[PDB]
Amino acid sequence: KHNMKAFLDELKAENIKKFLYNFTQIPHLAGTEQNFQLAKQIQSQWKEFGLDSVELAHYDVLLSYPNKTHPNYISIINEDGNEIFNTSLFEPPPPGYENVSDIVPPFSAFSPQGMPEGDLVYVNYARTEDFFKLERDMKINCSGKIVIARYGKVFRGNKVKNAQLAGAKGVILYSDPADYFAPGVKSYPDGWNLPGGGVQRGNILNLNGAGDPLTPGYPANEYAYRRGIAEAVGLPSIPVHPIGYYDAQKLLEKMGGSAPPDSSWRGSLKVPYNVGPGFTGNFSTQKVKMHIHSTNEVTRIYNVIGTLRGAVEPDRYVILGGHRDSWVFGGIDPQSGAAVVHEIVRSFGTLKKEGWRPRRTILFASWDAMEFGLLGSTEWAEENSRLLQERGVAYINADSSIEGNYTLRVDCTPLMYSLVHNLTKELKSPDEGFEGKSLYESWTKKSPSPEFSGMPRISKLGSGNDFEVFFQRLGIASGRARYTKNNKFSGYPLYHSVYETYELVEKFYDPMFKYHLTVAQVRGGMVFELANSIVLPFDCRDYAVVLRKYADKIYSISMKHPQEMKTYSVSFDSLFSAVKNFTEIASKFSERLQDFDKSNPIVLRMMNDQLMFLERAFIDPLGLPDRPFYRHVIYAPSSHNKYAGESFPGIYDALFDIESKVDPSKAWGEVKRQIYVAAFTVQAAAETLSEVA
Amino acid sequence: KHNMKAFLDELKAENIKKFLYNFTQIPHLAGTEQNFQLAKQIQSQWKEFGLDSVELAHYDVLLSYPNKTHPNYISIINEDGNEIFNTSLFEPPPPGYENVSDIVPPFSAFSPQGMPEGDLVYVNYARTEDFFKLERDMKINCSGKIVIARYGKVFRGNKVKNAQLAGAKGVILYSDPADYFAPGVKSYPDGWNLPGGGVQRGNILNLNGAGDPLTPGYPANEYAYRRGIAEAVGLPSIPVHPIGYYDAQKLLEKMGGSAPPDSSWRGSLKVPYNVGPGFTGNFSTQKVKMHIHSTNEVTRIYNVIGTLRGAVEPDRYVILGGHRDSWVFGGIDPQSGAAVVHEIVRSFGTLKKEGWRPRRTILFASWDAMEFGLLGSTEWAEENSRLLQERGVAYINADSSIEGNYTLRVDCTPLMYSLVHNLTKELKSPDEGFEGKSLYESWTKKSPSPEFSGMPRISKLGSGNDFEVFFQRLGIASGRARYTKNNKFSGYPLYHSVYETYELVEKFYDPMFKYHLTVAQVRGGMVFELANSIVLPFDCRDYAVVLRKYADKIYSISMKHPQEMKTYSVSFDSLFSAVKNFTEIASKFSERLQDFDKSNPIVLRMMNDQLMFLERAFIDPLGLPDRPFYRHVIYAPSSHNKYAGESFPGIYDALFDIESKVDPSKAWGEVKRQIYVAAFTVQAAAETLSEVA
Numbered sequence A, B: 001k002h003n004m005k006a007f008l009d010e011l012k013a014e015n016i017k018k019f020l021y022n023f024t025q026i027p028h029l030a031g032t033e034q035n036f037q038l039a040k041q042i043q044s045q046w047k048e049f050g051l052d053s054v055e056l057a058h059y060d061v062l063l064s065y066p067n068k069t070h071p072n073y074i075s076i077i078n079e080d081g082n083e084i085f086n087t088s089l090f091e092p093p094p095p096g097y098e099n100v101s102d103i104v105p106p107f108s109a110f111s112p113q114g115m116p117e118g119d120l121v122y123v124n125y126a127r128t129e130d131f132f133k134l135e136r137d138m139k140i141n142c143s144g145k146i147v148i149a150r151y152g153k154v155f156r157g158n159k160v161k162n163a164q165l166a167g168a169k170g171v172i173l174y175s176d177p178a179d180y181f182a183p184g185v186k187s188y189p190d191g192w193n194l195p196g197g198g199v200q201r202g203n204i205l206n207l208n209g210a211g212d213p214l215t216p217g218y219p220a221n222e223y224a225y226r227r228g229i230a231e232a233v234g235l236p237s238i239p240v241h242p243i244g245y246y247d248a249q250k251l252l253e254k255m256g257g258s259a260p261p262d263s264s265w266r267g268s269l270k271v272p273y274n275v276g277p278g279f280t281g282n283f284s285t286q287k288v289k290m291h292i293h294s295t296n297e298v299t300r301i302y303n304v305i306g307t308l309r310g311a312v313e314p315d316r317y318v319i320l321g322g323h324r325d326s327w328v329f330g331g332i333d334p335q336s337g338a339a340v341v342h343e344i345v346r347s348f349g350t351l352k353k354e355g356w357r358p359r360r361t362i363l364f365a366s367w368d369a370m371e372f373g374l375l376g377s378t379e380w381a382e383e384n385s386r387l388l389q390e391r392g393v394a395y396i397n398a399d400s401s402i403e404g405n406y407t408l409r410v411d412c413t414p415l416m417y418s419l420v421h422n423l424t425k426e427l428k429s430p431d432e433g434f435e436g437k438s439l440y441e442s443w444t445k446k447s448p449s450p451e452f453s454g455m456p457r458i459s460k461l462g463s464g465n466d467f468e469v470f471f472q473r474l475g476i477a478s479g480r481a482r483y484t485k486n487n488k489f490s491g492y493p494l495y496h497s498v499y500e501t502y503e504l505v506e507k508f509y510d511p512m513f514k515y516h517l518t519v520a521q522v523r524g525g526m527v528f529e530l531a532n533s534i535v536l537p538f539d540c541r542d543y544a545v546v547l548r549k550y551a552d553k554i555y556s557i558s559m560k561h562p563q564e565m566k567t568y569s570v571s572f573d574s575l576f577s578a579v580k581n582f583t584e585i586a587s588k589f590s591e592r593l594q595d596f597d598k599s600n601p602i603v604l605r606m607m608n609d610q611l612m613f614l615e616r617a618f619i620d621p622l623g624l625p626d627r628p629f630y631r632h633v634i635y636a637p638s639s640h641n642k643y644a645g646e647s648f649p650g651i652y653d654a655l656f657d658i659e660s661k662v663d664p665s666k667a668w669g670e671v672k673r674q675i676y677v678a679a680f681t682v683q684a685a686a687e688t689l690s691e692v693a
């Protein structure tokens, strides 16, 4: 038969390995010829695998590249202006790749040009609370200083935003061994650790969902009208550059001024971690000078879009998407995900050649320019937003399949919790010691839910990946899954470095490609069920449970300020009422879904439309404050860390640091406004599940 | 059988007459007890007529009322400050109503309080071009002056906005006999003309679609958080009051300064129509003083919502809605429409009692507080926006059924043109001389299309009525129809006056209620077809024809500036390309709609969803510039006259008066941006009609 078991059994570890090798021999940087050639290859292969149509969708978007004849670097300069120490111009290439052409040197994409010179302030992870500690407690002024921050904990674009608002004139980002060197493991090529010359690339935008900085709201097609640079979205105002820990040690060792305020400020290098400003007395006249010469450039990018037309509901789309562009070789990021998508397409195509079609249409996507700010997925969704909002059932992401080899990680909408528990109970665990047991059993054992016994942890969707437009802008139920470590926002040690190669994966992460196969089964199995189940596999009651958890959470935050809640009459009663109503209505809808006349395809589709439009109901067309492309009222990326999800984000940001606002009546008024918007949106989403007439 | 003929034959002129009499014996001002009682009566009657459910939906919204113990009036004051002339405190009540309680005196709803005193400038109709003529050509400065403007031509809220921006400190609105006294007809009670003591009530907001001024975006429910007055939407900044032509003559007769610039500035009173400022030499020391004491007040309003559940597609809604609140008796506005809705409900209920149900759900609405800014319809749509955007098939409005007795008037989306031509060919003409001929024949003969021989005129939807939220905010296909005169934006002579009574209609407009019956057949027949036709009765090819007409029109406007189009490379090629593509794709969709396997209900509903979501595709979630609740890219209310529709409004407003902008590069850049947005939206709407996979 053609059922999910036939699909899953066709997936092969050895195929995923072959595809990964094939995708990682040369760099595939967005906007380069090599990445266009790989796009054409995937288009051709998906056609041969049997998809109905496979097209390239191109856009011309703002990208950023170093200047090949005017390299970026940082110096220590003495009082005469001689450069006595320079940081590296490139990472030492790994064995056997020392002659590979077109490895982009480490840089921070979208940095402006400049050569600022000044004194160093060390700002730990450059988090909002790190800057609070510096200004408010230690009384250190970052204005006109160059800040040096360690990578880790939060998205680097938030670090740069925080440094700008502190008045910094430049930012140096570096990888501390505390965060990127696991104890007892060797440096690449002899293990999976970051060597001292390794450096993490990455963009430093603050797009808040906008996509291409020059075309917010509309696809960057041939006739698009572009903002000028000065009005672009999300560009940093100060120069930024990343370095490795050999170079950081040279910048940090001479630091003077104030001692670190506590041990959470100290990394693992043999330096004091002094906050500064500037260097100890002997070197007090030396300064640090950046030299950044990168350029922003409108450049063509290419998404591959494959279609497998549905047999019964061709106007309902289940999307499996992940990116193709990499910083260098992309051994983990993204090609361990792209190889998994390739094998899933191949498997679905095998069934199609034998005469099967899924019930609903499946769309497969290979996105471009993700590393430069989710640009390819966002421009495509801008072009196709009307089709997606009326027809989009679900989006399953497919970036890196592995970030470790310990257990499964799933982040998704509550609407998919039941689907994921049920599927993982049917899959075999690949873990040592769990031979013959389910993936559900190994996952629940290694990653227990903090809330429920005998359940696994499933996280909120945050951002920093290509589901953002589909979930937080358009309100399409979304999910992601990968194998993970036992620190989740800092990246694995060789993240975005030249050392992330096929050999890294084959030698140190997944020699038998069994974790890749398990992830292919989870992502593919989810797509299969979403595209084939007669009734969509969403359980609205799971949203009711989480809404109550998030309401309790945000109420608890507010209750730290009881005097103000009395003065300004701040009540959460309306939000709890809406959550209670959602719980009651979802329970009654679930009974009808179980009970309805199963011979009636209009009641079924009516009820399938109620399930599909439930995530859509949490969208507010006015967006969140000053972030028009984050429209979901229950979930947004954290305003302090794009990678993390925040619940009831409008109320959360209205309450954050509220005790510091100079006009408390205005600040608590805005808390009340956000409570009203959240209560109304929960009630309105509940009412979409009521009987329709 | 139960078919459209059974529905239409059940409608009775005599029933419409009985209901009109019943609805017009006492005033039904929004927010008053009498209007709540009428809402309860209609709820009870719709239940008895046989609807499945009938509920009141209430909201607490900002309304405005005069102060009963501190009356509004205008004076001429002499140099000592004695008030030598006062305008009336009330309209003389009509025969037999001189003892009716609670007639609200003439006032401009939402005027602020004040007692400004100054010199008079006469500004004709206070249109944008009238103010251009005064400032630019005649060099008259309105700053610190009281302006006097005649009603007519444009919505009075636009007149007040224009007067504010000219620096006026108050506005006096009056009815000139040129616009409100037809030659050879007697004044009320002896004919349908405005007497000299008659006055037009009406609000002077500039809401731009927002609804309740205090709650833009969200329903004004029990827990709503309200803007403060200073941040409310759309409130005027200067006092405003309306007067009749006996009083206007006293204010205008003493005017001096400049002569009227031409005859288009002169009305029909025996005065010079001097523009001012101020009075002729003998009276040069007299001034005009306003006394406005009205108050804005959050007040409860009540919509009645009736449901007739669909037999096959209960999750598809066809809405028939019109308002119930009136300024005084509402003999024409709205009760000639509300009586027609009442008879339509009664007829559908007769069929239902015999066992019939429509295919799709029909919703019937009696809206409140329309006269205060479309508040009841807009708050309800804000509450129910998710249901409406995913399920709303069409909205048919039902305000005044008559504004004359000459011929039919229809304004609607192009998607309903074919429906209207086909229905009116099946209906009998009620017109003298067309006995035995179709309504299509009489209408086409009396109101020929300016574009096509043998076709009738159908206008764009403008605004100033309760379809605005459904069409321009939410993108639901909408239409309206009424009997009309042979000046369409000024209102009939007794518009919004105490003289608009049952006797006005029964004696002078429609003694046999035949025009009311014809309008009931058109509105009811449209609802019937939309709710019962297997394939939705929309023709996408009609949108293609009009899009080309509007593209030619906006290109022609731009081509008045050939030098600038050369300098700034302003091309319309992308918009014509999108319109050509829409034409081709709509032609192919129409072939499939005719050809598809008619046994397949999923292809049918898939294709019905493509038809329903086509109007929805013209919505831009970012809205038009500075008007976030006007989201349709093809149609918006004119920025110069809310009642009129404008096509390609984003490009139109970017081009308007562009030769006066101080930075032409910036102004033509914004023209190009609006061309890009319009081209993209037309192409994206076209693509919703392509094969789905």
Ligand SMILES: *[C@@H]1O[C@H](CO)[C@@H](O[C@@H]2O[C@H](CO)[C@@H](O[C@@H]3O[C@H](CO[C@H]4O[C@H](CO)[C@@H](O)[C@H](O)[C@@H]4O)[C@@H](O)[C@H](O[C@H]4O[C@H](CO)[C@@H](O)[C@H](O)[C@@H]4O)[C@@H]3O)[C@H](O)[C@H]2NC(C)=O)[C@H](O)[C@H]1NC(C)=O
Binding pocket: A055, A056, A057, A058, A222, A223, B574, B575, B577, B578, B581, B679, B680, B683
């Ligand atoms: C009305 O409908 C038509 C389709 O019938 C649309 O036509 C498209 O028009 C655009 C022009 O705006 C064409 O864009 C061009 O695409 C070329 C590559 O196309 C190939 O590859 C894609 C896969 O991604 C296929 O879809 C396609 O069939 C082709 O196989 C580019 O090479 C072109 O860019 C080059 O020329 C331009 C202009 O000189 C330069 O600015 C560039 O730098 C570059 O050198 C260009 O981008 C597109 O191919 C057409 N599609 C077709 C025929 O299917 C219209 O766009 C549509 N109107 C609107 C308003 O949408």
Ligand SMILES: *[C@@H]1O[C@H](CO)[C@@H](O[C@@H]2O[C@H](CO)[C@@H](O[C@@H]3O[C@H](CO[C@H]4O[C@H](CO)[C@@H](O)[C@H](O)[C@@H]4O)[C@@H](O)[C@H](O[C@H]4O[C@H](CO)[C@@H](O)[C@H](O)[C@@H]4O)[C@@H]3O)[C@H](O)[C@H]2NC(C)=O)[C@H](O)[C@H]1NC(C)=O
Binding pocket: A574, A575, A577, A578, A581, A679, A680, A683, B055, B056, B057, B058, B222, B223
């Ligand atoms: C969770 O779900 C429940 C329903 O199970 C919703 O309950 C509604 O709650 C509101 C309160 O916010 C109630 O509003 C009150 O309505 C009264 C009139 O109700 C009658 O008429 C309507 C027809 O319009 C019917 O729908 C209804 O069944 C009743 O027949 C008003 O008189 C009340 O106003 C008075 O009291 C308040 C508070 O003291 C004053 O501020 C006012 O000035 C006034 O004196 C009030 O507006 C509503 O009736 C409830 N509906 C029910 C039970 O069906 C919850 O609202 C919902 N939670 C959320 C967040 O939506």
Ligand SMILES: *[C@@H]1O[C@H](CO)[C@@H](O[C@@H]2O[C@H](CO)[C@@H](O[C@@H]3O[C@H](CO)[C@@H](O)[C@H](O[C@H]4O[C@H](CO)[C@@H](O)[C@H](O)[C@@H]4O)[C@@H]3O)[C@H](O)[C@H]2NC(C)=O)[C@H](O)[C@H]1NC(C)=O
Binding pocket: A418, A419, A422, A537, A538, A539, A594, A595, A596, A598
């Ligand atoms: C994850 O798996 C769980 C466990 O299988 C699953 O929950 C189960 O769903 C089924 C529906 O397939 C439920 O079975 C129903 O139970 C009610 C009450 O006992 C019956 O009335 C239902 O009978 C109707 O429907 C049948 C078809 O399903 C017809 O044969 C019948 O004639 C009736 O029309 C029906 O049997 C079962 O109760 C739950 N078990 C639970 C909740 O413990 C869950 O749905 C899966 N999650 C997904 C798919 O997302």
Ligand SMILES: *[C@@H]1O[C@H](CO)[C@@H](O[C@@H]2O[C@H](CO)[C@@H](O[C@@H]3O[C@H](CO)[C@@H](O)[C@H](O[C@H]4O[C@H](CO)[C@@H](O)[C@H](O)[C@@H]4O)[C@@H]3O)[C@H](O)[C@H]2NC(C)=O)[C@H](O)[C@H]1NC(C)=O
Binding pocket: B418, B419, B422, B537, B538, B539, B594, B595, B596, B598
């Ligand atoms: C307004 O009225 C006009 C005039 O009636 C109407 O246009 C007509 O619509 C009918 C569809 O009902 C068209 O008839 C079709 O013509 C094509 C080509 O000749 C045929 O292939 C079609 O046959 C298929 O469908 C039939 C059911 O309709 C089946 O019996 C058959 O087996 C095939 O499946 C079909 O007969 C007719 O051509 C037009 N006439 C025109 C455009 O002049 C218009 O639709 C009405 N507007 C509305 C309802 O909004």
Ligand SMILES: *[C@@H]1O[C@H](CO)[C@@H](O[C@@H]2O[C@H](CO)[C@@H](O)[C@H](O)[C@H]2NC(C)=O)[C@H](O)[C@H]1NC(C)=O
Binding pocket: A021, A022, A023, A025, A040, A041, A044, A045
């Ligand atoms: C990755 O695999 C692809 C597909 O097998 C290879 O591209 C093919 O290469 C052969 C030999 O040059 C050609 O005859 C085909 O036309 C290519 N097919 C396609 C679809 O492009 C490619 O060589 C492999 N890359 C690496 C680095 O091994």
Ligand SMILES: *[C@@H]1O[C@H](CO)[C@@H](O[C@@H]2O[C@H](CO)[C@@H](O)[C@H](O)[C@H]2NC(C)=O)[C@H](O)[C@H]1NC(C)=O
Binding pocket: A081, A082, A083, A084, A085, A086
């Ligand atoms: C760090 O790099 C800089 C730039 O290449 C070096 O300084 C240059 O040295 C050359 C040759 O002596 C001079 O002609 C240039 O004028 C210098 N440029 C600048 C900008 O100072 C510097 O020598 C390097 N420092 C170390 C320690 O290697």
Ligand SMILES: *[C@@H]1O[C@H](CO)[C@@H](O[C@@H]2O[C@H](CO)[C@@H](O)[C@H](O)[C@H]2NC(C)=O)[C@H](O)[C@H]1NC(C)=O
Binding pocket: B021, B022, B023, B025, B040, B041, B044, B045
């Ligand atoms: C308008 O018609 C309604 C409905 O016939 C009248 O209200 C009814 O009046 C009688 C007598 O007072 C009562 O017994 C009923 O309870 C009322 N019914 C409803 C549904 O309200 C009303 O009197 C009429 N109004 C006028 C001005 O004629």
Ligand SMILES: *[C@@H]1O[C@H](CO)[C@@H](O[C@@H]2O[C@H](CO)[C@@H](O)[C@H](O)[C@H]2NC(C)=O)[C@H](O)[C@H]1NC(C)=O
Binding pocket: B081, B082, B083, B084, B085, B086
């Ligand atoms: C117009 O109305 C005003 C206000 O009622 C009249 O002026 C008042 O006259 C009374 C009685 O003589 C005085 O006690 C008040 O002080 C006056 N009020 C003001 C504001 O001036 C005025 O007489 C009326 N004019 C005409 C021509 O009827």
Ligand SMILES: CC(C)C[C@H](NC(=O)N[C@@H](CCC(=O)O)C(=O)O)C(=O)O
Binding pocket: A202, A203, A370, A371, A372, A373, A374, A399, A400, A463, A464, A465, A488, A489, A490, A491, A492, A495, A642, A643
């Ligand atoms: C390793 C995690 C924390 C981040 C990783 N995502 C990314 O690397 N995204 C890129 C682009 C993110 C964006 O621009 O939003 C970045 O963070 O530089 C992932 O989701 O696998």
Ligand SMILES: CC(C)C[C@H](NC(=O)N[C@@H](CCC(=O)O)C(=O)O)C(=O)O
Binding pocket: B202, B203, B370, B371, B372, B373, B374, B399, B400, B463, B464, B465, B488, B489, B490, B491, B492, B495, B642, B643
């Ligand atoms: C008589 C026409 C021009 C206007 C009439 N509409 C109205 O009277 N609407 C009211 C409220 C309009 C609004 O606030 O937008 C008004 O114009 O004062 C109608 O559409 O029948």
Ligand SMILES: *[C@@H]1O[C@H](CO)[C@@H](O)[C@H](O)[C@H]1NC(C)=O
Binding pocket: A067, A068, A069, A070, A295
């Ligand atoms: C890069 O640097 C070179 C050499 O200094 C210079 O000539 C050129 O202008 C720069 N290129 C770009 C693209 O800015």
Ligand SMILES: *[C@@H]1O[C@H](CO)[C@@H](O)[C@H](O)[C@H]1NC(C)=O
Binding pocket: A141, A142, A143, A144
């Ligand atoms: C930090 O330094 C700058 C200039 O040196 C100054 O303008 C700013 O107010 C300072 N902030 C403090 C002391 O908080």
Ligand SMILES: *[C@@H]1O[C@H](CO)[C@@H](O)[C@H](O)[C@H]1NC(C)=O
Binding pocket: A192, A404, A405, A508, A509
């Ligand atoms: C793979 O698993 C083993 C066993 O737990 C572990 O020691 C090793 O660190 C893992 N490799 C990676 C890259 O995490």
Ligand SMILES: *[C@@H]1O[C@H](CO)[C@@H](O)[C@H](O)[C@H]1NC(C)=O
Binding pocket: B067, B068, B069, B070, B295
């Ligand atoms: C209306 O005017 C009276 C009498 O001058 C005054 O006492 C009252 O304050 C006013 N009422 C309102 C509602 O403003």
Ligand SMILES: *[C@@H]1O[C@H](CO)[C@@H](O)[C@H](O)[C@H]1NC(C)=O
Binding pocket: B141, B142, B143, B144
């Ligand atoms: C109109 O008058 C006011 C003050 O009397 C002045 O500020 C304004 O600039 C004048 N405008 C002109 C003369 O255009």
Ligand SMILES: *[C@@H]1O[C@H](CO)[C@@H](O)[C@H](O)[C@H]1NC(C)=O
Binding pocket: B192, B404, B405, B508, B509
């Ligand atoms: C009704 O129709 C007649 C005949 O054309 C016309 O003279 C009269 O003015 C009409 N009444 C109204 C109110 O227009």
